[PDB]
């Protein structure tokens, strides 16, 4: 085992000296911001109090060195300096963690990367996105398999930049500023325009949790009255969708490639069989059984 570390340093050009720090980097300020909330009260990152202990202790150390001081005092400073740089990088990894008011440990540099709330899982492997919405879902029994009911208010906001252009093309609005207000106030002219842009322009529907890829499918949006989402009754199996009040997210593919992938790859009617057993999924169930039986 000990060889694995000693060997690693030979092949790489890394000087093992790197494991001891003469200098500590300082992260840019906007990544550890200090800002005033609405009302003026201030909030800042824990990183700054952590950086503050380090620099405070380093500066005291310089002071004691220059006066001359018994090793007891000086060595005590170096021990404190060592612990403060530990808390900065990894807090609580050794000893009790540095805490703030209420005794809650401060978040270290390591706390950024790690965990479900760290950079990787929170901000990297997933993230929040533009051109999306959600609502509660209701049954679509009159829908064709490739279609979905989309609340017209929801559709309007999702497609807002599209219609803004369209109603400037048609002369409804003279400039983009007027187009934007026309959509916000929901002046009646926009609706006819919305149906234009939304035509044959697909959208992805997702219900959490997403177990298999069939948990996301593309449909053909249909403007619908009301604030709910009309879901075709044959896709409930794949989404595992209960109408007990489940909600679903809508995503608007933008680029030509994204729309192509929606129509071809993810379209509802092209995904019927489960891609596990090959058995049919969209096959009738419940009511539809007893009706045909």
């Amino acid at each position: 085992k000990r060889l694995k570390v000693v060997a690693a340093f030979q092949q790489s050009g890394n000087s093992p000296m790197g494991m001891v720090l003469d200098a500590v980097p300082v992260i840019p300020p906007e990544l550890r911001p200090m800002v005033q909330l609405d009302g003026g009260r201030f909030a800042t990152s824990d990183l700054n109090d952590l950086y503050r202990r380090v620099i405070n202790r380093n500066n005291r150390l310089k002071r004691l060195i220059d006066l001359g001081a018994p090793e007891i005092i000086v060595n005590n400073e170096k021990r404190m300096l060592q612990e403060s740089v530990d808390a900065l990088f990894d807090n609580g990894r050794r000893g009790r963690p540095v805490t703030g008011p209420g005794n809650r440990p401060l978040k270290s540099l390591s706390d950024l990367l790690k965990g479900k709330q760290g950079r990787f899982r929170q901000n990297l492997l997933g993230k929040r996105v533009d051109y999306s919405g959600r609502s509660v879902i209701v049954v679509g029994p009159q829908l064709k398999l490739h279609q979905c009911g989309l609340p017209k208010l929801m559709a309007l906001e999702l497609f807002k930049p599209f219609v803004m252009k369209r109603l400037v093309d048609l002369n409804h609005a003279q400039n983009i500023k007027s187009a934007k207000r026309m959509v916000e106030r929901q002046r009646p002219q926009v609706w006819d325009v919305l149906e234009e842009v939304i035509a044959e322009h697909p959208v992805l529907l997702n219900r959490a949790p997403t177990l298999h890829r069939l948990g996301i499918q593309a449909f053909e949006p249909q403007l619908v009255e009301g604030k709910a989402i009309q879901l075709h009754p044959l896709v409930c199996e794949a989404f595992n969708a209960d109408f007990d009040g489940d909600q679903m997210a809508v995503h608007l593919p933008l680029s030509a490639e994204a729309q192509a992938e929606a129509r071809i790859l993810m379209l509802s009617s092209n995904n019927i069989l489960s891609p596990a057993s090959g058995k049919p999924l969209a096959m009738p169930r419940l009511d539809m059984v007893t009706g045909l039986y």
Binding site: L211, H212, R213, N271, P275, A276, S277, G278
Partner: protein, 129 residues
């Protein structure tokens, strides 16, 4: 663990495979599951009855008719292509992977079958008591 496994090529051409049981010992009676084992595969070698006539050639899809046809000739096993024996340098090959459960046809060359496998396995996990 499986996310980087995607179909990289049509055929690695290996003759290697795995032996599927395809029932046995009757009548004197399909194996309870040939649907998740023998079906959707592709034959590694020709399936030959005594003495015999080669009822199905290597590379056949092995649908429902093929199992009936084979069963008549009295073949109690078949050697099949699998991703376990696939020799592809990167990823796996379509022929070894076999039919796409979604399309019902030979898997497409872009398919990422690791993720699909991961999900196909984990999804029912909720139903596992």
């Amino acid at each position: 663990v499986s996310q980087d496994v995607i179909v990289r090529e049509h055929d690695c051409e290996t003759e290697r495979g795995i032996n599927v049981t395809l029932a046995e010992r009757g009548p004197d009676i399909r194996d309870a599951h040939v649907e998740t084992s023998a079906f959707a595969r592709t034959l590694a070698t020709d399936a030959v009855d005594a003495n015999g006539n080669v009822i199905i050639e290597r590379g056949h899809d092995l649908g429902d008719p093929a199992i009936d046809a084979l069963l008549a000739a009295g073949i109690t096993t078949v050697k099949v292509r699998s991703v376990l024996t696939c020799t592809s340098a990167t990823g796996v090959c379509a022929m070894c992977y076999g039919r796409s459960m979604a399309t019902g046809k030979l898997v497409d060359i872009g398919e990422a079958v690791g993720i699909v496998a991961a999900q196909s396995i984990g999804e029912p996990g909720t139903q596992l008591t």
